[PDB]
PDB file of C-alpha atoms in Angstrom:
ATOM      1  CA  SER A   1     308.558 106.157 136.251  1.00 15.78           C
ATOM      2  CA  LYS A   2     306.769 102.917 137.114  1.00 14.40           C
ATOM      3  CA  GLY A   3     304.408 103.339 134.175  1.00 17.48           C
ATOM      4  CA  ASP A   4     307.336 103.472 131.756  1.00 18.13           C
ATOM      5  CA  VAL A   5     307.943  99.744 132.229  1.00 22.10           C
ATOM      6  CA  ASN A   6     305.250  99.402 129.561  1.00 20.18           C
ATOM      7  CA  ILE A   7     308.052  99.631 127.002  1.00 19.47           C
ATOM      8  CA  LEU A   8     309.189  96.164 128.075  1.00 21.30           C
ATOM      9  CA  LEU A   9     305.835  94.577 127.233  1.00 20.45           C
ATOM     10  CA  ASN A  10     304.636  93.563 123.773  1.00 19.88           C
ATOM     11  CA  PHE A  11     301.236  94.897 122.695  1.00 20.90           C
ATOM     12  CA  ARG A  12     300.921  92.564 119.724  1.00 21.36           C
ATOM     13  CA  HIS A  13     297.234  91.689 119.705  1.00 19.94           C
ATOM     14  CA  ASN A  14     295.648  94.060 117.218  1.00 20.90           C
ATOM     15  CA  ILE A  15     291.923  94.648 117.493  1.00 24.22           C
ATOM     16  CA  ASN A  16     290.532  97.284 115.155  1.00 24.53           C
ATOM     17  CA  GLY A  17     293.799  99.200 114.961  1.00 28.09           C
ATOM     18  CA  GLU A  18     294.696  99.230 118.649  1.00 25.13           C
ATOM     19  CA  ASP A  19     297.735  97.266 119.837  1.00 22.43           C
ATOM     20  CA  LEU A  20     296.852  95.371 122.992  1.00 22.25           C
ATOM     21  CA  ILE A  21     297.910  92.948 125.701  1.00 26.31           C
ATOM     22  CA  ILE A  22     295.487  90.579 127.433  1.00 30.18           C
ATOM     23  CA  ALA A  23     294.751  91.385 131.083  1.00 28.82           C
ATOM     24  CA  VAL A  24     293.314  89.007 133.676  1.00 29.58           C
ATOM     25  CA  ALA A  25     291.959  90.510 136.913  1.00 31.10           C
ATOM     26  CA  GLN A  26     292.268  88.160 139.902  1.00 31.11           C
ATOM     27  CA  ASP A  27     291.242  88.568 143.561  1.00 28.71           C
ATOM     28  CA  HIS A  28     294.520  89.006 145.446  1.00 30.05           C
ATOM     29  CA  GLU A  29     293.336  86.956 148.413  1.00 32.09           C
ATOM     30  CA  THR A  30     290.930  84.304 147.082  1.00 32.26           C
ATOM     31  CA  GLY A  31     292.580  83.792 143.698  1.00 30.66           C
ATOM     32  CA  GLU A  32     289.247  83.898 141.874  1.00 31.06           C
ATOM     33  CA  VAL A  33     289.466  85.218 138.311  1.00 29.65           C
ATOM     34  CA  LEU A  34     287.189  88.263 138.226  1.00 30.29           C
ATOM     35  CA  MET A  35     287.378  89.286 134.572  1.00 30.41           C
ATOM     36  CA  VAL A  36     289.348  89.276 131.330  1.00 29.74           C
ATOM     37  CA  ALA A  37     289.897  92.386 129.211  1.00 29.15           C
ATOM     38  CA  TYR A  38     292.450  94.129 127.012  1.00 30.69           C
ATOM     39  CA  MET A  39     294.826  97.002 127.737  1.00 32.43           C
ATOM     40  CA  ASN A  40     296.510  99.276 125.234  1.00 30.89           C
ATOM     41  CA  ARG A  41     299.782 100.991 126.137  1.00 30.22           C
ATOM     42  CA  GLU A  42     298.119 103.957 127.842  1.00 28.79           C
ATOM     43  CA  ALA A  43     295.800 101.763 129.927  1.00 27.03           C
ATOM     44  CA  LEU A  44     298.741  99.809 131.306  1.00 28.33           C
ATOM     45  CA  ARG A  45     300.741 102.973 131.962  1.00 27.24           C
ATOM     46  CA  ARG A  46     297.883 104.584 133.874  1.00 29.39           C
ATOM     47  CA  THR A  47     297.258 101.380 135.796  1.00 32.74           C
ATOM     48  CA  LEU A  48     300.875 101.363 136.951  1.00 33.27           C
ATOM     49  CA  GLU A  49     300.786 105.092 137.702  1.00 32.39           C
ATOM     50  CA  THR A  50     297.631 105.091 139.850  1.00 32.49           C
ATOM     51  CA  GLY A  51     297.579 101.531 141.137  1.00 31.79           C
ATOM     52  CA  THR A  52     294.000 101.220 139.873  1.00 33.52           C
ATOM     53  CA  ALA A  53     292.912  99.082 136.909  1.00 32.65           C
ATOM     54  CA  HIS A  54     292.431 100.769 133.527  1.00 30.32           C
ATOM     55  CA  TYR A  55     291.383  98.799 130.437  1.00 33.57           C
ATOM     56  CA  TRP A  56     290.781  99.380 126.740  1.00 33.91           C
ATOM     57  CA  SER A  57     287.215  98.918 125.544  1.00 34.53           C
ATOM     58  CA  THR A  58     287.136  97.446 122.036  1.00 37.27           C
ATOM     59  CA  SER A  59     283.404  98.110 121.737  1.00 39.90           C
ATOM     60  CA  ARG A  60     283.642 101.627 123.147  1.00 43.74           C
ATOM     61  CA  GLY A  61     286.947 102.322 121.409  1.00 40.33           C
ATOM     62  CA  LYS A  62     288.647 104.021 124.347  1.00 39.51           C
ATOM     63  CA  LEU A  63     290.411 103.226 127.592  1.00 40.24           C
ATOM     64  CA  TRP A  64     288.362 103.382 130.769  1.00 42.28           C
ATOM     65  CA  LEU A  65     288.913 103.216 134.509  1.00 43.30           C
ATOM     66  CA  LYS A  66     287.233 100.136 135.954  1.00 43.92           C
ATOM     67  CA  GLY A  67     284.525 101.505 138.229  1.00 43.64           C
ATOM     68  CA  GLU A  68     284.385 104.846 136.397  1.00 41.39           C
ATOM     69  CA  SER A  69     280.609 104.891 136.869  1.00 41.32           C
ATOM     70  CA  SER A  70     279.890 102.292 139.565  1.00 38.50           C
ATOM     71  CA  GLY A  71     282.714 103.086 141.958  1.00 37.08           C
ATOM     72  CA  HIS A  72     283.676  99.425 141.716  1.00 38.10           C
ATOM     73  CA  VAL A  73     287.360 100.165 141.255  1.00 37.81           C
ATOM     74  CA  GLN A  74     290.113  97.559 141.338  1.00 39.78           C
ATOM     75  CA  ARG A  75     293.118  98.425 143.487  1.00 41.24           C
ATOM     76  CA  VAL A  76     296.138  96.714 141.938  1.00 43.13           C
ATOM     77  CA  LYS A  77     298.433  94.952 144.396  1.00 45.69           C
ATOM     78  CA  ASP A  78     300.673  93.085 141.951  1.00 48.18           C
ATOM     79  CA  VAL A  79     301.120  92.827 138.174  1.00 44.70           C
ATOM     80  CA  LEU A  80     302.316  89.467 136.843  1.00 45.89           C
ATOM     81  CA  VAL A  81     303.712  89.275 133.313  1.00 45.81           C
ATOM     82  CA  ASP A  82     303.496  86.533 130.658  1.00 45.30           C
ATOM     83  CA  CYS A  83     306.684  84.806 129.455  1.00 44.53           C
ATOM     84  CA  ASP A  84     306.413  86.711 126.156  1.00 43.70           C
ATOM     85  CA  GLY A  85     305.251  89.921 127.820  1.00 43.52           C
ATOM     86  CA  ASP A  86     301.957  90.241 125.930  1.00 47.50           C
ATOM     87  CA  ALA A  87     299.564  89.497 128.792  1.00 47.04           C
ATOM     88  CA  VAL A  88     299.340  90.287 132.495  1.00 48.38           C
ATOM     89  CA  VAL A  89     297.522  89.114 135.605  1.00 48.10           C
ATOM     90  CA  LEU A  90     296.428  91.884 137.952  1.00 49.02           C
ATOM     91  CA  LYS A  91     296.135  90.807 141.588  1.00 49.65           C
ATOM     92  CA  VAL A  92     293.463  93.172 142.842  1.00 51.69           C
ATOM     93  CA  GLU A  93     291.280  94.269 145.716  1.00 52.55           C
ATOM     94  CA  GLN A  94     287.822  94.479 144.152  1.00 52.00           C
ATOM     95  CA  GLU A  95     285.365  97.112 145.335  1.00 51.44           C
ATOM     96  CA  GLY A  96     281.804  95.887 144.895  1.00 53.37           C
ATOM     97  CA  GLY A  97     281.582  93.507 141.952  1.00 47.29           C
ATOM     98  CA  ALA A  98     283.632  93.196 138.775  1.00 52.05           C
ATOM     99  CA  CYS A  99     280.581  92.450 136.631  1.00 54.90           C
ATOM    100  CA  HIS A 100     277.784  94.859 135.724  1.00 55.31           C
ATOM    101  CA  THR A 101     275.262  92.056 136.306  1.00 57.55           C
ATOM    102  CA  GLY A 102     275.981  92.362 140.003  1.00 55.89           C
ATOM    103  CA  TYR A 103     278.150  89.282 140.412  1.00 58.51           C
ATOM    104  CA  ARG A 104     281.589  89.621 141.972  1.00 55.23           C
ATOM    105  CA  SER A 105     283.087  87.823 138.984  1.00 55.57           C
ATOM    106  CA  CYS A 106     282.147  87.913 135.303  1.00 56.00           C
ATOM    107  CA  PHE A 107     282.600  84.149 135.368  1.00 60.92           C
ATOM    108  CA  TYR A 108     279.418  83.383 137.295  1.00 58.73           C
ATOM    109  CA  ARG A 109     278.360  80.637 134.873  1.00 59.75           C
ATOM    110  CA  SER A 110     279.867  77.254 134.027  1.00 62.45           C
ATOM    111  CA  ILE A 111     279.391  74.609 131.347  1.00 63.16           C
ATOM    112  CA  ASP A 112     276.957  71.956 132.577  1.00 63.47           C
ATOM    113  CA  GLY A 113     276.423  69.266 129.972  1.00 61.78           C
ATOM    114  CA  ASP A 114     275.046  71.180 127.003  1.00 58.97           C
ATOM    115  CA  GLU A 115     273.957  74.277 128.926  1.00 61.79           C
ATOM    116  CA  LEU A 116     275.424  77.249 130.793  1.00 61.85           C
ATOM    117  CA  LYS A 117     274.134  77.586 134.353  1.00 64.21           C
ATOM    118  CA  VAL A 118     274.817  80.106 137.109  1.00 65.75           C
ATOM    119  CA  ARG A 119     277.203  78.570 139.639  1.00 66.68           C
ATOM    120  CA  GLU A 120     275.568  77.957 143.022  1.00 66.75           C
ATOM    121  CA  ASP A 121     278.576  79.404 144.841  1.00 68.86           C
ATOM    122  CA  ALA A 122     278.576  82.603 142.778  1.00 69.92           C
ATOM    123  CA  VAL A 123     277.905  85.821 144.691  1.00 71.42           C
ATOM    124  CA  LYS A 124     275.698  88.648 143.444  1.00 70.33           C
ATOM    125  CA  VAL A 125     277.327  91.521 145.338  1.00 68.94           C
ATOM    126  CA  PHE A 126     274.897  94.180 144.118  1.00 68.93           C
ATOM    127  CA  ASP A 127     271.720  94.650 142.095  1.00 68.51           C
ATOM    128  CA  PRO A 128     271.999  96.765 138.912  1.00 69.13           C
TER     129      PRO A 128
ATOM    130  CA  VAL B   1     277.911  74.090 123.882  1.00 68.19           C
ATOM    131  CA  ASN B   2     279.838  76.070 121.263  1.00 67.96           C
ATOM    132  CA  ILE B   3     276.469  77.540 120.286  1.00 70.57           C
ATOM    133  CA  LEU B   4     276.290  79.129 123.742  1.00 68.49           C
ATOM    134  CA  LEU B   5     279.615  80.956 123.416  1.00 68.03           C
ATOM    135  CA  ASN B   6     280.491  84.093 121.460  1.00 69.49           C
ATOM    136  CA  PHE B   7     283.614  83.729 119.316  1.00 68.32           C
ATOM    137  CA  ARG B   8     284.681  87.195 118.172  1.00 66.50           C
ATOM    138  CA  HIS B   9     288.327  87.777 119.091  1.00 69.06           C
ATOM    139  CA  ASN B  10     289.268  87.987 115.414  1.00 67.27           C
ATOM    140  CA  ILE B  11     292.981  87.582 114.704  1.00 68.88           C
ATOM    141  CA  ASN B  12     294.274  86.520 111.275  1.00 71.79           C
ATOM    142  CA  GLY B  13     290.704  85.738 110.264  1.00 68.42           C
ATOM    143  CA  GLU B  14     289.644  83.288 112.963  1.00 68.50           C
ATOM    144  CA  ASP B  15     286.759  83.642 115.439  1.00 66.85           C
ATOM    145  CA  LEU B  16     288.132  83.129 118.947  1.00 68.20           C
ATOM    146  CA  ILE B  17     287.547  83.276 122.692  1.00 69.35           C
ATOM    147  CA  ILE B  18     290.142  83.894 125.397  1.00 66.96           C
ATOM    148  CA  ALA B  19     290.950  80.973 127.681  1.00 68.75           C
ATOM    149  CA  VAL B  20     292.538  81.327 131.112  1.00 68.75           C
ATOM    150  CA  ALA B  21     294.075  78.122 132.454  1.00 71.48           C
ATOM    151  CA  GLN B  22     293.890  78.158 136.247  1.00 70.07           C
ATOM    152  CA  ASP B  23     295.175  75.514 138.673  1.00 70.48           C
ATOM    153  CA  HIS B  24     292.062  73.792 140.045  1.00 71.10           C
ATOM    154  CA  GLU B  25     293.686  73.437 143.470  1.00 72.28           C
ATOM    155  CA  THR B  26     295.875  76.492 144.107  1.00 75.12           C
ATOM    156  CA  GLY B  27     293.995  78.969 141.930  1.00 73.67           C
ATOM    157  CA  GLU B  28     297.193  80.160 140.277  1.00 72.84           C
ATOM    158  CA  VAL B  29     296.752  81.406 136.719  1.00 73.54           C
ATOM    159  CA  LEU B  30     299.007  79.171 134.620  1.00 76.12           C
ATOM    160  CA  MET B  31     298.636  80.749 131.177  1.00 74.23           C
ATOM    161  CA  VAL B  32     296.314  82.519 128.759  1.00 76.11           C
ATOM    162  CA  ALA B  33     295.645  81.537 125.148  1.00 75.74           C
ATOM    163  CA  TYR B  34     292.975  81.673 122.453  1.00 76.51           C
ATOM    164  CA  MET B  35     290.549  78.943 121.412  1.00 80.41           C
ATOM    165  CA  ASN B  36     288.663  78.639 118.146  1.00 77.55           C
ATOM    166  CA  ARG B  37     285.449  76.612 117.861  1.00 76.94           C
ATOM    167  CA  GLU B  38     287.364  73.378 117.241  1.00 77.19           C
ATOM    168  CA  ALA B  39     289.841  73.963 120.077  1.00 79.30           C
ATOM    169  CA  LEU B  40     287.026  74.260 122.615  1.00 79.06           C
ATOM    170  CA  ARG B  41     285.038  71.474 120.984  1.00 77.97           C
ATOM    171  CA  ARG B  42     288.009  69.126 121.349  1.00 80.13           C
ATOM    172  CA  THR B  43     288.739  70.333 124.880  1.00 78.40           C
ATOM    173  CA  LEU B  44     285.267  69.346 126.071  1.00 77.48           C
ATOM    174  CA  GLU B  45     285.395  66.037 124.175  1.00 78.15           C
ATOM    175  CA  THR B  46     288.811  64.877 125.401  1.00 77.60           C
ATOM    176  CA  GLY B  47     288.954  66.629 128.754  1.00 78.60           C
ATOM    177  CA  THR B  48     292.389  67.960 127.825  1.00 79.63           C
ATOM    178  CA  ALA B  49     293.135  71.604 127.047  1.00 80.78           C
ATOM    179  CA  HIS B  50     293.269  72.368 123.325  1.00 82.67           C
ATOM    180  CA  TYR B  51     294.154  75.858 122.113  1.00 78.11           C
ATOM    181  CA  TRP B  52     294.482  77.729 118.845  1.00 78.08           C
ATOM    182  CA  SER B  53     297.873  79.176 117.973  1.00 78.70           C
ATOM    183  CA  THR B  54     297.391  82.529 116.256  1.00 78.77           C
ATOM    184  CA  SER B  55     301.029  82.391 115.148  1.00 83.01           C
ATOM    185  CA  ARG B  56     301.059  78.772 113.958  1.00 83.98           C
ATOM    186  CA  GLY B  57     297.547  79.138 112.593  1.00 83.85           C
ATOM    187  CA  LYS B  58     296.689  75.633 113.784  1.00 87.67           C
ATOM    188  CA  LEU B  59     295.088  73.691 116.630  1.00 84.74           C
ATOM    189  CA  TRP B  60     297.321  72.983 119.621  1.00 84.68           C
ATOM    190  CA  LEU B  61     297.090  70.324 122.336  1.00 82.76           C
ATOM    191  CA  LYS B  62     298.910  71.685 125.383  1.00 82.33           C
ATOM    192  CA  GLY B  63     301.657  69.193 126.180  1.00 82.96           C
ATOM    193  CA  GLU B  64     301.221  67.256 122.941  1.00 83.41           C
ATOM    194  CA  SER B  65     305.021  67.243 122.761  1.00 81.00           C
ATOM    195  CA  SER B  66     306.267  67.697 126.332  1.00 78.82           C
ATOM    196  CA  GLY B  67     303.615  65.502 127.922  1.00 83.56           C
ATOM    197  CA  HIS B  68     302.639  68.427 130.133  1.00 83.23           C
ATOM    198  CA  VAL B  69     298.927  68.133 129.374  1.00 84.57           C
ATOM    199  CA  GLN B  70     296.213  70.018 131.254  1.00 84.29           C
ATOM    200  CA  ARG B  71     293.257  67.919 132.352  1.00 82.02           C
ATOM    201  CA  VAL B  72     290.140  70.095 132.460  1.00 83.80           C
ATOM    202  CA  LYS B  73     287.994  69.800 135.591  1.00 84.51           C
ATOM    203  CA  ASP B  74     285.602  72.691 135.037  1.00 87.48           C
ATOM    204  CA  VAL B  75     284.904  75.479 132.550  1.00 88.45           C
ATOM    205  CA  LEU B  76     283.647  78.902 133.649  1.00 84.96           C
ATOM    206  CA  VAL B  77     282.120  81.318 131.120  1.00 84.26           C
ATOM    207  CA  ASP B  78     282.296  85.124 130.811  1.00 83.07           C
ATOM    208  CA  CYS B  79     279.098  87.197 131.028  1.00 85.96           C
ATOM    209  CA  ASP B  80     279.229  87.882 127.287  1.00 85.68           C
ATOM    210  CA  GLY B  81     280.487  84.403 126.433  1.00 86.87           C
ATOM    211  CA  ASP B  82     283.752  85.372 124.752  1.00 88.58           C
ATOM    212  CA  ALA B  83     286.108  84.238 127.507  1.00 90.47           C
ATOM    213  CA  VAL B  84     286.437  81.109 129.619  1.00 93.82           C
ATOM    214  CA  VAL B  85     288.330  79.966 132.683  1.00 95.40           C
ATOM    215  CA  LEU B  86     289.677  76.429 132.543  1.00 95.77           C
ATOM    216  CA  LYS B  87     290.061  74.836 135.973  1.00 95.61           C
ATOM    217  CA  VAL B  88     292.853  72.349 135.328  1.00 97.61           C
ATOM    218  CA  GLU B  89     295.230  69.780 136.761  1.00 96.75           C
ATOM    219  CA  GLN B  90     298.623  70.652 135.274  1.00 96.26           C
ATOM    220  CA  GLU B  91     301.154  67.923 134.583  1.00 96.67           C
ATOM    221  CA  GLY B  92     304.701  69.238 134.891  1.00 93.45           C
ATOM    222  CA  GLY B  93     304.725  72.924 134.014  1.00 92.77           C
ATOM    223  CA  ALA B  94     302.627  75.167 131.785  1.00 90.76           C
ATOM    224  CA  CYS B  95     305.553  77.239 130.496  1.00 92.86           C
ATOM    225  CA  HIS B  96     308.354  76.145 128.161  1.00 88.83           C
ATOM    226  CA  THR B  97     310.839  78.162 130.228  1.00 90.20           C
ATOM    227  CA  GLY B  98     310.395  75.382 132.761  1.00 91.83           C
ATOM    228  CA  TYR B  99     308.332  77.411 135.207  1.00 92.40           C
ATOM    229  CA  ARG B 100     305.019  76.197 136.615  1.00 94.22           C
ATOM    230  CA  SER B 101     303.179  79.240 135.260  1.00 94.66           C
ATOM    231  CA  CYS B 102     303.875  81.533 132.302  1.00 96.76           C
ATOM    232  CA  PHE B 103     303.346  84.345 134.783  1.00 97.79           C
ATOM    233  CA  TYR B 104     306.507  83.650 136.769  1.00 97.81           C
ATOM    234  CA  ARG B 105     307.559  87.322 136.831  1.00 97.02           C
ATOM    235  CA  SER B 106     306.018  90.509 138.188  1.00 94.91           C
ATOM    236  CA  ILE B 107     306.668  94.207 137.688  1.00 96.20           C
ATOM    237  CA  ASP B 108     308.847  95.137 140.648  1.00 98.34           C
ATOM    238  CA  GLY B 109     309.154  98.896 140.461  1.00100.38           C
ATOM    239  CA  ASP B 110     310.805  99.348 137.076  1.00 98.37           C
ATOM    240  CA  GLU B 111     311.851  95.860 135.938  1.00 96.95           C
ATOM    241  CA  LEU B 112     310.483  92.370 135.275  1.00 96.62           C
ATOM    242  CA  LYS B 113     311.746  90.134 138.065  1.00 97.87           C
ATOM    243  CA  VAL B 114     311.167  86.474 138.838  1.00 96.81           C
ATOM    244  CA  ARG B 115     308.595  86.094 141.624  1.00 95.78           C
ATOM    245  CA  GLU B 116     309.761  84.576 144.899  1.00 96.46           C
ATOM    246  CA  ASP B 117     306.793  82.204 144.690  1.00100.28           C
ATOM    247  CA  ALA B 118     307.821  81.168 141.180  1.00100.21           C
ATOM    248  CA  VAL B 119     308.745  77.494 140.994  1.00 99.93           C
ATOM    249  CA  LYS B 120     310.789  76.034 138.155  1.00 99.85           C
ATOM    250  CA  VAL B 121     309.280  72.583 137.656  1.00101.51           C
ATOM    251  CA  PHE B 122     311.686  71.382 134.964  1.00102.55           C
ATOM    252  CA  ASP B 123     314.757  72.466 133.008  1.00102.50           C
ATOM    253  CA  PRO B 124     314.250  72.862 129.228  1.00103.63           C
TER     254      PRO B 124
END
């Protein structure tokens, strides 16, 4: 199956006992990086099986479907792989916003001098 | 600025944040790597991407040997401050395989195949 390709990747980033790869979610049309998270073997396999983004929560200690509660799922259109196979870029179609704060992207702030300010071109898609 | 970020991606006993190098013009993700406090500190000071090699256990200036440095134009920060996006101008290629981006392959059904939009900048 498609999900079985996971055997070709290297989950060598260990965080609290779970072997993981780094995953970057990117808007398939605009190219904007929406979020960064980890995936364990099962999360990648399920992502490939359903075509919807699944990640591994290090704080929650379990894999979860992005949008499990908000409905803000990420439909995966392409999965790019790192040269060493331990990270991937997911080209996605983002429903709602990727961040729980309401912004489309988790990266709604930027370094300005010695402070972190909300970008003026950032978009708050919804209000939590 | 380091005070505003949250280093916690612990690997081999070293507080880190995840850095995503993205082409400032095309938006293509060129590579992903970790940064320790010093790596980021030096990146902001020099304007050139500095990373932390978890394997080498030492600081690393991208292109310090190949000359393929990444000039930082902007730095975006994650909501919880443990990840950043580096908007950069890439000299040459970001990958030692010679390709423009480390992510020059995609899962095509059941294998890892070179992307048709993958461009091999140089030959190692």
